[PDB]
Amino acid sequence: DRINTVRGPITISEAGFTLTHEHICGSSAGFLRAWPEFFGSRAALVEKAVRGLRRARAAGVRTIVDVSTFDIGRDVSLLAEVSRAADVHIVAATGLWEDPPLSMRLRSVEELTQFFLREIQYGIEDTGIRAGIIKVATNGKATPFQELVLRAAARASLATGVPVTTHTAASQRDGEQQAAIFESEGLSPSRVCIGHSDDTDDLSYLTALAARGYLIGLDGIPHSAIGLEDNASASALLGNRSWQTRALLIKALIDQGYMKQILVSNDWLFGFSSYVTNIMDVMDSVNPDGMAFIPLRVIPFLREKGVSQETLAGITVTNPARFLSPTLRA
């Protein structure tokens, strides 16, 4: 019962209020090292992230789970530096997202399992920092390689107790296939969060997952392009459903009896090179609260709509602790 962070193991009690799907920087493997000026400078990115995490900490956040994989350009040295300076725990991820390079896409399920286990059990690169979560992705029907990634993630989870969290095209109901593959490997749904699930309003899809034991990641609450006029790229990324609409899915699942299975987050970033240039500026204009958006805006909104403080504390503290603490069956 300890959770690996970029600064070492922490007890479940130390995690506190936890955002379960966030990014310091959404990039690509090697990109921050090769082209730091894309972000102004590495120091500028560090400074921005520390300011943002300090603001989140002032609003009550104690831990974020950075679900950046290898192919999101996860730099655990950057995460450790930012975590130290902001006094916010950061859980790092292994796994693979939607942009694996050839050297990953040509691998077998066994090889991929070895790589994920390396990052969980030994360390990331030469840093000794161990991942506390496994991140995977589909965008519609899984590609053949994505099927291997899902299976390898299940195998790594079954060996270590570390949970799996997923990226979906929620409107395509990807979670159903993801669940099918995970269960074919014997993985407990208690160890899996189906993420980007606030991208859909289909309650039959969401409750079908929750009914069989999955955690539901409502992780992009502030993502919306409403009020951005004539920005095609921002609308394609963020959608045109309001943050209130996304947040009300939290209340819906509470009202259906799934309060213990909800995980809430911002899916925010402090740099973002894997999309159009200046998307970060657009996103910061939409949501200047950044990662503090959940505690500063969503929690009071749900309280106004009748959700209790106790229930929201369970969702933001108890559920992330139960999810992250390593086990085969949570």
Next chain:
Amino acid sequence: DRINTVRGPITISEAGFTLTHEHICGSSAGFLRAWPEFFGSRAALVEKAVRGLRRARAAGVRTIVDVSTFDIGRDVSLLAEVSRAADVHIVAATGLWEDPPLSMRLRSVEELTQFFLREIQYGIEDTGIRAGIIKVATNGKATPFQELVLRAAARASLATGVPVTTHTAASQRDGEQQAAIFESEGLSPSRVCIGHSDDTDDLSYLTALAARGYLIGLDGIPHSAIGLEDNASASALLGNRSWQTRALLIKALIDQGYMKQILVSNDWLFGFSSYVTNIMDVMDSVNPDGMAFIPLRVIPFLREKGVSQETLAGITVTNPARFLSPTLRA
């Protein structure tokens, strides 16, 4: 008139016998750092590369051009270590090959030009090592992003005098479109090598490029799967034309008056993670000479077929020096 290597500038005289298309390791950005055990260990890869380069040096090679880009997982610290230990100059590359990540594929022609110029004029990552060549790629008709890469490579070459070298699907005559795009930006064909050109027997394609001034990269001479029975992956990568057939294209271009435009190489590697597992073992069984294959087997073969020593010295020493030495018009 100095050429950048991973150990600093060298004079044109110091380059000597030069292989113009080689790789220490064919991988993906960040992969060697994240999963060195894929290659046994980093130290094992270093040892293998040093042994191979020492064998090449004993056969007469003095310089190789490592045309690994960012997305081939070029590790210039690895190149410098291997170059020091083997006493063989290594020229590093910028540019982009066929596996760019999202953080590259979303960039503009201007942004890409900035990145290529960074690696030529300032340094690669934080190493201060500067690229001496720009590598680009198409596989058939250029994708929209590949058109931007080709244009940015031309712009970087026009600003610095550093040459461009290309990957083609030679049987699809990619060099014709590559030339068209390069020339639309004003780039001199004297600054461009159209590579993998030994993958085709079409002399009308090859002479059409050479006639307008391009250098012709006959750079995969030992690549052949003849005599490998029932290895689909090796045959798809290496082809079923013999090394003698590839080598005779050198003689053909000499006989057509293009001796000053021929560049010859092995396109060898000491590690190879961007293809099927154990491809390196298959390749080493096909060609145990590795990068020494050109001087030990191809040069004597061409001499037996009537090519003079003087002409082969011009192709292996003079042409690479004229190609690499920075200039707008060579």
